Design a protein around this ligand. Structure first.
Ligand SMILES: [K+]
Ligand SMILES: [K+]
Ligand SMILES: [K+]
Ligand SMILES: [K+]
Ligand SMILES: [K+]
Ligand SMILES: [K+]
Ligand SMILES: [K+]
Ligand SMILES: [K+]
Ligand SMILES: [K+]
Ligand SMILES: [K+]
Ligand SMILES: [K+]
Ligand SMILES: [K+]
Ligand SMILES: [K+]
Ligand SMILES: [K+]
Ligand SMILES: [K+]
Ligand SMILES: [K+]
Ligand SMILES: [K+]
Ligand SMILES: [K+]
Ligand SMILES: [K+]
Ligand SMILES: [K+]
Ligand SMILES: [K+]
Ligand SMILES: [K+]
Ligand SMILES: [K+]
Ligand SMILES: [K+]
Ligand SMILES: [K+]
Ligand SMILES: [Mg+2]
Ligand SMILES: [Mg+2]
Ligand SMILES: [Mg+2]
Ligand SMILES: [Mg+2]
Ligand SMILES: [Mg+2]
Ligand SMILES: [Mg+2]
Ligand SMILES: [Mg+2]
Ligand SMILES: [Mg+2]
Ligand SMILES: [Mg+2]
Ligand SMILES: [Mg+2]
Ligand SMILES: [Mg+2]
Ligand SMILES: [Mg+2]
Ligand SMILES: [Mg+2]
Ligand SMILES: [Mg+2]
Ligand SMILES: [Mg+2]
Ligand SMILES: [Mg+2]
Ligand SMILES: [Mg+2]
Ligand SMILES: [Mg+2]
Ligand SMILES: [Mg+2]
Ligand SMILES: [Mg+2]
Ligand SMILES: [Mg+2]
Ligand SMILES: [Mg+2]
Ligand SMILES: [Mg+2]
Ligand SMILES: [Mg+2]
Ligand SMILES: [Mg+2]
Ligand SMILES: [Mg+2]
Ligand SMILES: [Mg+2]
Ligand SMILES: [Mg+2]
Ligand SMILES: [Mg+2]
Ligand SMILES: [Mg+2]
Ligand SMILES: [Mg+2]
Ligand SMILES: [Mg+2]
Ligand SMILES: [Mg+2]
Ligand SMILES: [Mg+2]
Ligand SMILES: [Mg+2]
Ligand SMILES: [Mg+2]
Ligand SMILES: [Mg+2]
Ligand SMILES: [Mg+2]
Ligand SMILES: [Mg+2]
Ligand SMILES: [Mg+2]
Ligand SMILES: [Mg+2]
Ligand SMILES: [Mg+2]
Ligand SMILES: [Mg+2]
Ligand SMILES: [Mg+2]
Ligand SMILES: [Mg+2]
Ligand SMILES: [Mg+2]
Ligand SMILES: [Mg+2]
Ligand SMILES: [Mg+2]
Ligand SMILES: [Mg+2]
Ligand SMILES: [Mg+2]
Ligand SMILES: [Mg+2]
Ligand SMILES: [Mg+2]
Ligand SMILES: [Mg+2]
Ligand SMILES: [Mg+2]
Ligand SMILES: [Mg+2]
Ligand SMILES: [Mg+2]
Ligand SMILES: [Mg+2]
Ligand SMILES: [Mg+2]
Ligand SMILES: [Mg+2]
Ligand SMILES: [Mg+2]
Ligand SMILES: [Mg+2]
Ligand SMILES: [Mg+2]
Ligand SMILES: [Mg+2]
Lengths: 147, 187, 105
RNA sequence: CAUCUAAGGCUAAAUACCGGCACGAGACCGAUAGUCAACAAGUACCGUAAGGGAAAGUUGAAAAGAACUUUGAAGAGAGAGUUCAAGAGGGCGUGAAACCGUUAAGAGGUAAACGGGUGGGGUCCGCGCAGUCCGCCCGGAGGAUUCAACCCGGCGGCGGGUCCGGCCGUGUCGGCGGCCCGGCGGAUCUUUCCCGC
RNA sequence: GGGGACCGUCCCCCGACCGGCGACCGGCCGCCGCCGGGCGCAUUUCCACCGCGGCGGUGCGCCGCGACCGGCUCCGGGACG
RNA sequence: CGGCGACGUCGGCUACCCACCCGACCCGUCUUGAAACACGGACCAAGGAGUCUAACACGUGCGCGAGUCGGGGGCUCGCACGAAAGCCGCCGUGGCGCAAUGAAGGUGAAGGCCGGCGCGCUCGCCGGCCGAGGUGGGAUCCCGAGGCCUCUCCAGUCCGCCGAGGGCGCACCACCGGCCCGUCUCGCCCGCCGCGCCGGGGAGGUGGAGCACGAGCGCACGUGUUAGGACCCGAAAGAUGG
RNA sequence: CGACCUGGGUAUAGGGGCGAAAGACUAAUCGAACCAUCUAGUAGCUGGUUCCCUCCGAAGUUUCCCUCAGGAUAGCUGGC
RNA sequence: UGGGCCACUUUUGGUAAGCAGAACUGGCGCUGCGGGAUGAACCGAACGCCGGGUUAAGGCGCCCGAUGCCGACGCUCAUCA
RNA sequence: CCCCGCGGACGCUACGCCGCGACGAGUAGGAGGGCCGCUGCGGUGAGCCUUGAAGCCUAGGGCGCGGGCCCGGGUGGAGCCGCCGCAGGUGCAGAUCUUGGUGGUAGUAGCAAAUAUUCAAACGAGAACUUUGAAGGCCGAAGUGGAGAAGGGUUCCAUGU
RNA sequence: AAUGCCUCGUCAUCUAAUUAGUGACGCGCAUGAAGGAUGAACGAGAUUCCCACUGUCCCUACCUACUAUCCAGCGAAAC
RNA sequence: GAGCAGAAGGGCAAAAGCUCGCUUGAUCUUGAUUUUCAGUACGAAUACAGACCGUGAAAGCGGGGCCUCACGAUCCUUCU
RNA sequence: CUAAUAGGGAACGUGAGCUGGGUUUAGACCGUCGUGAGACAGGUUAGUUUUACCCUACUGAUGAUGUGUUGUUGCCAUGGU
């Protein structure tokens, strides 16, 4: 809505808010990111450190699919199965532990942030972090790898 | 003429909700009366929170509410939050909770009720505790927002750990001069 | 000029973009026109399936999608051989066939 | 090790469309706007040429477009007439401002003009011109039912152990009740009764 | 592959207790109110007129005057220490 | 309390003309400074200049919320409106968020207390519990000795108000610890179908846009910056083809 | 009476022509014609920038800049 | 916004400057009003629209509000006071 | 335990109403409010209107601090407005602004290069300028004469206005 | 010297009087050889003097034509 | 009142000066801080900490010059 | 020559008053400088001097206000000198 903007309030005011002395001129200071190493150096250094220069090795023909490895933490691990699955295992008399296939849920690597409920579980993943494996074995579970 | 400064005369504060939510306006009317006609400072705090913007009324996760409710001496007290209560899927055991909130997520509401809990709105809280007696007034993390990572000292200043605004994250995006000693300076 | 904190922006509007702008005001008309063609095609092949030939079961190539199965272009010649269907008869009875697909497993 | 088989050829659909033919529509513009062009407009006109390129819509419902008389050489007038209207008369709907003519009022040697304060005059306004209305009571002089209270009927408001139902909210049991005689879901278990190895 | 069992939400019912009839409604009662029709036909009630009537409110068609009270202010007399 | 009221007067500070007293230089603009011997402006009418798209940032409003979003497609008599609206759910592919760090190979965020033991060697095997530590502030909330009452007292029956002190402490702030990735220094152990120029672990500093019981996503509005003709008008020029 | 004057027909075209040479002339245009287009070329420079009331209310300073008629930066301002 | 300028005092260059350059506070710029006849900066004082009272700086022959006091004490004659 | 009286003002668009205290300069600039204003769209006003819409004019009556608005009178002759939302090509004194129109200047500058006109008559409403006659002059054959080229294109010739 | 600052160079001639002219001199700021130095004729070329001539002047006056001026008609512009 | 490399100022006497002896702390590292300052960078500097050393009997002192100046981003190249 | 041949101001008075000799455009020559284009408070030569009819000022020319109209003869405020 143009009726809600400053232009409707700047009618009758000669400089339209831009000022009498400095005026409103086309491009004082340059166009775009002009003078980032010259007359705009302080802004670029103050707010965008690292902007200028090369770092690291380039890699031609990067294929993002090859590096595809979504991760899930242990605190969210039991959300990949139904609530029926986890209550049944807890009240199960035997040592039967449910299987959580994180690849089926869309994750490849299991990370170890958080803590697990005290009940065994079999976790199937492409990759495991060291601490995720340790926490799964602490609750009596097992980690088995898939390809 | 008198020698004073007039730049601080008008205190900048919410005197009403900028929302046009008629249900929020109704319970603002209810708590405007309660704050005026009672000596309860609880009603004053609740009333001024009702004016607040959404960013000033952050959501309260179920885990945070449970953790504050589990502190000693808070048994059989009502958890009051002027905002949204959110399910936390990181918790596995929900205890019995008496809860008043402006708004409760459907999954969080089902979990609280299934655990034998009780959910109140602010109109029902007024009838239950008009002065707010036996309540625990909670708040979500006010600085739990992405904007606050960018606030503070400028990123290109020494001993500043504030997130810069970058369109992309990668080795080519603002990781060179001014970020490492090899590339001019680091600070 | 830069003004305080902000994102260094690089808009790609230096190349006379206004002379090549694709509006989508014909999108509702395009959806109608394709739907008429779909309905007309279905009537033309009256008992034959509207979608078309049966397509094979196909596993997606890369390590991102290789847990997912989709439909392929056509059944392989090896698939047709052990199914007992001639590669020239299959296209006449609604079986899509891809001569250039091999079966590694 | 994988993958294809160049240096020959064809092939519809999905896609594009500020030119063309024919259509439909619009939170667009409304005659200095919208196409340059609402009209004998790429016209008139300009330039040797390439090329440049306007302005310009509206009487009235109907011409019923002012017969006739009179002055003048005529333009132009005065009468008359048409019309609801010519205080609509062929560039004619409305008809602003700048500017001009005339009439009326007022004023005038410090250029006009202006702010504040009064005074004088003038045009108008005030149903101005013997200046409010209305509540109760008192007194006088007249009418009308019927005033209250009782009877009948109708309709409302409030209350009632639910007086009686119909309920509703929350639990409470047999589940009689659904995978045949009720559904939808579950990353929960199975033929150890049944169709492909 | 089915078909089953179980679990979670449901469903309409057969029924009781629980809080209430609620802003979900009816019937009966009780009280109150209104309306219509009778009766009541005059020390009641109501209507309009008059008084240069009284009490209240508002306000005087215009132009004026006075009085006391209170606020602010500028002055002037008298007396005491 | 008084006077006066219809063809002459009564009221109307507004509005028309005139008179007088006081005040009063022509606006706009640049500028330290304009009445300027600084520029533009004879007069009137109509036109006439911060817009739209995209991308960010922050604030505000709305919905849902560890999710969110169908915008591309498809299904609905194919169409007055309707080119709208509705629906999809094995259409959520995908985007953004839910994890960071390193150039990279890669790696990748849980602690506290109670016990027996090696030697409780700054320490390794377990048990049990609780589930992101602690200090100082901290709205609010909780307990609360003692007070406030009645025609009066020996003696408590029910709750209300004030209340010194004490307690749990939201958000947030300061600080101290802890955890993840990079990199140094020191050092000793452990694992095996590959006994390896193999793999893992510890302590102490330090680099990170991190963790430490999520806050985001979509839509709308405002402001600011930017690319676009870019608030409007303005060169001297350059190029192509005639 | 001459390197004379002049009509018409021809030829030379734009960074080209033609010049007894003045940067002269090349359709009133020449130290680079004219026409259309790129093109609404760019401008740190000049001029303008349209209703009312209310509230708050500056700076001409710091640092860096081929910076000195301009920006970035801190300061001063307002809003939430 | 990033052209400043002015005044008391301190202060550098210069013969000096309504010159040039600093320090400090205030001001003008951005500010009207009373006074200085007149005037960006001086003196007083800062401002919504008004009535009454009183002042500041400055004034009280006349212009022009106020000495039209029986004001006090002296000094001074100028043919450029 | 109100009752000889059966009765007892207003209020509270809560985005409303009421009370008390202090304060009020302002360029550049920022913000808020606008029952200020323009045009169009969705709703709404059982809205207005040929018994007169819009527009325009007005020594008419008023309202608002103001932007502006309402009403009377006239003209006009067919449409228009209020309120709740929505959306802009939305407000002018300037830009040596664009287009159009109009003033003062001003009945002014001016209608002065190449010697020159006069008398009578005719037609005619009308004669310094037309025609005829008479007279006086000029071009003076390198013409103010007679014919062509280029260019123009009907200007040629009669009659009429 | 159209080439010399100092410079109105110095001397002679021209005049009553000459920052002018001509003739002469030359350590010439900074002359000079395809251009130096001369030389008739020629020149809408620059300069000095003389005779004659004159309103250039002393020192202005008068006359003529067309205007301006006034009138009838017509009728702008700059600003 | 000398000298301490140089401009000047400060500092210094069994010193910081002069002469000998032995040496390489003018080495390898991580952070913090000061100066300019926006409290950005460079340069320079201060105090630590971890190595490896030098000197001295030792306490200690030393990671350049008694202190105040003596110097240089991105991109690229070269070496370790 | 003369009594004397004093010094100055008025936008270094006075260009819609003139003139255009000088300086100060474009042509050209010389000297010096410069590789060159070109330069020279060095010399030389040739080089468009536009408009008033507006307001005021001034110069002259009619008139205008008051004594009823109109005329004759006069006075002198003031200004010049
Ligand atoms: K602005
Ligand atoms: K604040
Ligand atoms: K046009
Ligand atoms: K056309
Ligand atoms: K008409
Ligand atoms: K001017
Ligand atoms: K869609
Ligand atoms: K998703
Ligand atoms: K990574
Ligand atoms: K823009
Ligand atoms: K052409
Ligand atoms: K010839
Ligand atoms: K050219
Ligand atoms: K400068
Ligand atoms: K700023
Ligand atoms: K700035
Ligand atoms: K409407
Ligand atoms: K108003
Ligand atoms: K009208
Ligand atoms: K020779
Ligand atoms: K000659
Ligand atoms: K530093
Ligand atoms: K040692
Ligand atoms: K290097
Ligand atoms: K005299
Ligand atoms: Mg302003
Ligand atoms: Mg303006
Ligand atoms: Mg401006
Ligand atoms: Mg005040
Ligand atoms: Mg203020
Ligand atoms: Mg047009
Ligand atoms: Mg029109
Ligand atoms: Mg005529
Ligand atoms: Mg009419
Ligand atoms: Mg007309
Ligand atoms: Mg008139
Ligand atoms: Mg200006
Ligand atoms: Mg100036
Ligand atoms: Mg001005
Ligand atoms: Mg001046
Ligand atoms: Mg100018
Ligand atoms: Mg103009
Ligand atoms: Mg002008
Ligand atoms: Mg307009
Ligand atoms: Mg749709
Ligand atoms: Mg996905
Ligand atoms: Mg704490
Ligand atoms: Mg810490
Ligand atoms: Mg910003
Ligand atoms: Mg170029
Ligand atoms: Mg433009
Ligand atoms: Mg242009
Ligand atoms: Mg530079
Ligand atoms: Mg300027
Ligand atoms: Mg400036
Ligand atoms: Mg400056
Ligand atoms: Mg100064
Ligand atoms: Mg100066
Ligand atoms: Mg200024
Ligand atoms: Mg100020
Ligand atoms: Mg002031
Ligand atoms: Mg004054
Ligand atoms: Mg004075
Ligand atoms: Mg006063
Ligand atoms: Mg005075
Ligand atoms: Mg007086
Ligand atoms: Mg103000
Ligand atoms: Mg506009
Ligand atoms: Mg205008
Ligand atoms: Mg004339
Ligand atoms: Mg003439
Ligand atoms: Mg002759
Ligand atoms: Mg001839
Ligand atoms: Mg003829
Ligand atoms: Mg000589
Ligand atoms: Mg002479
Ligand atoms: Mg030679
Ligand atoms: Mg050390
Ligand atoms: Mg002069
Ligand atoms: Mg002249
Ligand atoms: Mg002159
Ligand atoms: Mg000359
Ligand atoms: Mg010359
Ligand atoms: Mg040479
Ligand atoms: Mg000479
Ligand atoms: Mg000549
Ligand atoms: Mg004349
Ligand atoms: Mg005299």
């Amino acid at each position: 809505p143009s009726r809600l903007r400053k232009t409707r309030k700047l009618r009758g005011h000669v400089s339209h808010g831009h000022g009498r002395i400095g005026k409103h001129r086309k491009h004082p200071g340059g166009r775009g990111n002009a003078g980032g190493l010259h007359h705009h150096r302080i802004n670029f250094d103050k707010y965008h450190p690292g902007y200028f220069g090369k770092v690291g090795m380039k890699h031609y023909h990067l294929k993002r699919n090859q590096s595809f490895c979504p991760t899930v933490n242990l605190d969210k691990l039991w959300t990949l199965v139904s609530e029926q699955t986890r209550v049944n295992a807890a009240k199960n008399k035997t040592g039967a532990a449910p299987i959580i296939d994180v690849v089926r849920s869309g994750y490849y690597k299991v990370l170890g942030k958080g803590k697990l409920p005290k009940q065994p579980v079999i976790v199937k993943a492409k990759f495991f972090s060291r601490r995720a494996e340790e926490k799964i074995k602490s609750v009596g579970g097992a980690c088995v790898l898939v390809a | 003429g008198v020698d004073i400064r007039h730049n601080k005369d008008r205190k900048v504060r919410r005197k009403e909700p900028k929302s046009q939510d008629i249900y929020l306006r109704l319970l603002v009317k209810l708590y405007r009366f309660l704050a005026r006609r009672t000596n309860s400072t609880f009603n004053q705090v609740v009333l001024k929170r009702l004016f607040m913007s959404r960013t000033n009324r952050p959501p309260l996760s179920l885990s945070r509410m449970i953790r504050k409710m589990k502190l000693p001496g808070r048994e059989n007290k009502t958890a009051v939050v002027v905002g949204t209560i959110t399910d936390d899927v990181r918790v596995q055991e929900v205890p019995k909770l008496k809860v008043c909130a402006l708004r409760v997520t459907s999954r969080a509401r089902s979990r609280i009720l299934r655990a034998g809990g009780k959910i109140l709105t602010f109109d029902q809280l007024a009838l239950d505790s008009p002065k707010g007696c036996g309540t625990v007034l909670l708040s979500g993390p006010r600085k739990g927002r992405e904007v606050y990572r960018h606030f503070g000292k400028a990123p290109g200043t020494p001993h500043s750990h504030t997130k810069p605004y970058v369109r992309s994250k990668g080795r080519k995006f603002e990781r060179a001069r001014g970020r490492r000693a090899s590339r001019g300076y680091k600070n | 000029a830069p003004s305080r904190n902000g994102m260094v922006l690089k808009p790609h509007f230096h190349k006379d973009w206004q002379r090549r702008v694709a509006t989508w005001f014909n999108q509702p008309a395009r959806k109608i026109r394709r739907r008429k063609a779909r309905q007309a095609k279905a009537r033309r092949i009256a008992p034959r399936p509207a979608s078309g030939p049966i397509r094979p079961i196909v596993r997606c190539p890369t390590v991102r999608y290789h847990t997912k199965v989709r439909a392929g272009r056509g059944f392989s010649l090896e698939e047709l051989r052990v199914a007992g269907i001639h590669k020239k008869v299959a296209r006449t009875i609604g079986i899509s066939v891809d001569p250039r697909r091999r079966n590694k497993s």
